[PDB]
Design a protein around this nucleic acid. Structure first.
Ligand SMILES: *O[C@H]1[C@@H](O)[C@H](n2cnc3c(N)ncnc32)O[C@@H]1COP(=O)(O)OP(=O)(O)OP(=O)(O)O
Lengths: 276, 172, 234
RNA sequence: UAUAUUUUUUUUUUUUUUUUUUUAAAAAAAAAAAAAAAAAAUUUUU
């Protein structure tokens, strides 16, 4: 219910990102404030906090540090992220500013060898989903099996290891989930494979599925609260109708230039749960 | 506070500024950091029409001047149109006038807003904003005229305590 | 807008007094920064706010026929109090600079310390030394100016003969430059041949004292040090 | 050697100079200045 974003740096923002298309420096700053307003109105997050400015544009990815599964947190392993570890320190401050340290993922960070990324782990009603691919190992799945697992008539919690190809993007990017037994999936090979893998597991779930054209960034969170809303890029129009036909209210947001930068909804915000 | 003026929300920032205003310290680094943070937060609307008065009053009483901060506060107050009532508008004018060493084109716009807030205000804010406009140093013929026109109805409410300020502002 | 009674400390006994570090003679507020005095101490020759104590023999007095020593409050010469405050600050500065172990330098400059009109708070004239000391240490509405005269040169040459001064360097032409930068500041002294032979940071003002006299010549005592820098970048 | 910022992208009006055309006067263009206007740029390890 706590969401963190970082404002971009105007002086050091590079044009012509790693796709061969130039970008407009002013347009990013223009769109960011409207994104902030939409995020703070869209009723999906309780609070939004504005992180300070930093030079590196790769620091605009507020996520990929620390994932919230329940009342406790999980820091990400330090593997190839050392070059920006310093700025990671700053982020934690803002978190601790209005929240506790939870478990500090001592169990996860110090798990011998670790390869985790925020987005491979997606929560679900009485379930956890881990996208076993080129980013997550089986040791992480075993650790989550040890930690977040309970089995009983009412203490029912499950973990699903989903197989994916090497070229597939992270799990939380394409196939997501929205409340009230609605499951959003891309209409590509990766999405179909993920849907089939989920269907082979726990047939009694009875999860309706809605398809979206590939290449669409969307943000949707389970949350302790129940809400019917989704954040969708203001591009492909057919996805909005496809998801609205199922009774879910869509909300459009503009991410053309930041898409050319290569920044997704999952890494644009940092969801957190704060309790007492 | 000096090393923590960066990691605060709006409410904490305004509460801390209000708390430190009354003491009388003049730590320059703390005030610079808090001014930056206020400027950063005011870029995207994050201040209700109750903390701008507190921030402006605290900075004005603290005797610290900055064109950028006061410009940002004025712009944010300008964005929240029709939300600020007269009871929440006069103190902002008083605080801005107390640091009257400023430039025009700012009181020019404040003159426009004062046009429609003259009806439902009593003699106290009348005299106070009249002294404030006098200290601004700009001749507002129409604003002074309408203030004179509306002031005579509430001549009975004059307690003779603040008659001195409204008399002295004319000499000013 | 558009303490003074308690400034003299007369209307009661301030609770929790005297239980503080001996920093009464200087103003200390809680890293490198140029033009930032870390300790200010205003001084004067005609006016000194310091009383003294002395011993007496009260045996004559009707009742003190059994006590041999009794102290009484006596005023003191301003110069002695100024010297006492100066040495009290100097020992503190010596201990601090020894703890830091920076290269130590001491300067005694002749010139006028001309202040600005905005120093006088409340737009008053008469005020105690304490309030003006705090105002100078906080607002810094002052500027130091160094100036001498040529006509005294021969005169102070006599002082040389009075103090057996010896010439270690004749008249030398040097090009002082301030090699600033976007991150830090630096200085250099180009020689007559026009090359850069030293690379260093600007001086760090660690302690400043203004000794104001009645007439024109005033004295400024400065303790300054230089922070170290890796010779690779130099 | 205790006063930090300077301002900037773009539109309207006025003034001055130069080249060209026509009948001392008019028009387009280039340069400069002035006024106005929309919009944008700050820099901490407990
Ligand atoms: O006292 C200063 C000042 O008069 C002048 N100076 C240096 N840097 C200055 C800046 N940035 N603005 C104005 N004035 C400046 O030069 C001296 C510096 O010392 P100097 O007179 O050269 O000699 P001294 O202090 O004895 O020893 P240095 O090592 O400082 O040279």
């Amino acid at each position: 219910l706590h969401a963190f974003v970082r404002s971009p740096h105007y002086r050091t923002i590079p044009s012509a990102g790693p796709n061969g298309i130039v970008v407009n420096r002013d347009m990013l700053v223009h769109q960011f404030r409207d994104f902030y307003k939409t995020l703070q109105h869209c009723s999906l997050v309780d609070k939004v906090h504005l992180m300070s400015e930093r030079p590196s544009v790769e620091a605009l990815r507020v996520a990929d540090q620390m994932v919230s599964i329940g009342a406790t947190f999980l820091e990400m392993p330090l593997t190839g992220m050392e070059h920006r570890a310093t700025e990671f320190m700053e982020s934690m401050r803002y978190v601790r500013g209005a929240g506790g340290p939870s478990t500090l993922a001592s169990y996860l960070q110090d798990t011998e060898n670790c390869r985790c990324n925020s987005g491979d782990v997606v929560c679900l009603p009485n379930g956890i989903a881990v996208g076993h691919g080129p980013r997550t190992n089986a040791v992480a799945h075993t650790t989550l099996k040890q930690l977040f697992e309970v089995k009983d008539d009412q203490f029912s919690f499950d973990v699903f290891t989903l197989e994916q190809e090497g070229d597939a993007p992270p799990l939380g990017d394409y196939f997501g989930f929205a409340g009230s037994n609605v499951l959003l999936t891309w209409k590509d090979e990766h999405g179909l494979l993920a849907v089939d893998q989920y269907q082979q597991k726990q047939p009694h779930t009875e999860m309706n599925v809605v398809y979206l054209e590939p290449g669409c960034h969307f943000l949707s969170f389970y949350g302790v609260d129940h809400t019917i809303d989704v954040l969708v890029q203001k591009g492909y129009e057919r996805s909005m109708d496809s998801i609205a036909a199922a009774g879910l209210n869509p909300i459009p947001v503009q991410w053309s230039e930041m898409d050319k930068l290569g920044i997704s909804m999952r890494a644009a915000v940092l969801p957190l749960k704060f309790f007492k | 506070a000096a090393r923590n003026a960066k990691f605060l929300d709006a409410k904490d920032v305004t509460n801390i500024i209000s708390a430190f205003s009354k003491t009388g310290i003049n730590h320059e680094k703390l005030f610079a950091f808090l001014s930056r943070r206020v400027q950063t937060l005011a870029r995207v609307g994050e201040f209700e029409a109750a903390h701008l008065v507190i921030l402006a009053n605290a900075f004005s009483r603290l005797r610290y001047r900055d064109k950028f901060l006061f410009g940002a506060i004025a712009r944010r107050a300008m964005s929240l149109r029709e939300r600020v009532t007269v009871n929440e508008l006069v103190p902002l004018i008083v605080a801005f006038s107390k640091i009257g060493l400023k430039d025009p084109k700012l009181s020019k716009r404040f003159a426009t807003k004062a046009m429609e807030y003259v009806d439902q205000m009593n003699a106290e804010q009348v005299a106070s904003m009249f002294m404030a406009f006098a200290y601004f140093g700009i001749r507002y013929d129409q604003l002074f005229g309408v203030l004179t026109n509306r002031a005579v109805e509430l001549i009975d409410e004059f307690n003779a305590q603040y008659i001195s300020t409204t008399l002295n502002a004319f000499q000013r | 807008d558009y303490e003074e009674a308690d400034e003299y400390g007369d209307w009661g006994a301030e609770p929790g007094f005297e239980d503080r570090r001996e920093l009464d003679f200087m103003e200390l507020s809680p890293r490198y920064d140029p033009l930032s005095p870390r300790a200010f101490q205003l001084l004067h020759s005609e006016t000194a706010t310091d009383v003294g104590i002395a011993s007496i023999d009260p045996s004559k007095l009707p009742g003190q026929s059994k006590v041999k020593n009794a102290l009484a409050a006596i005023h003191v010469a301003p110069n002695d109090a100024n010297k006492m405050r100066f040495r009290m600050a100097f020992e503190w500065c010596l201990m601090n600079i020894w703890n830091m172990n920076m290269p130590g330098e001491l300067n005694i400059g002749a010139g006028k310390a001309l202040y600005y009109r905005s120093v006088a708070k409340q737009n008053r004239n008469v005020m105690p030394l304490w309030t003006v000391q705090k105002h100078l240490y906080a607002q810094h509405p002052y500027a130091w100016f160094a100036i001498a005269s040529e006509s005294n040169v021969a005169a102070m040459e006599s002082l040389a003969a009075a103090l057996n001064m010896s010439i270690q360097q004749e008249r030398t032409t040097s090009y002082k430059v301030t090699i600033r930068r976007m991150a830090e500041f630096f200085d250099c002294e180009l020689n007559g041949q026009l090359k850069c032979t030293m690379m260093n940071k600007p001086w760090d003002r660690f302690f400043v004292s203004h000794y104001i006299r009645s007439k024109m010549p005033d004295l400024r005592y400065v303790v300054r040090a230089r922070h170290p820098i890796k010779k690779r970048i130099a």
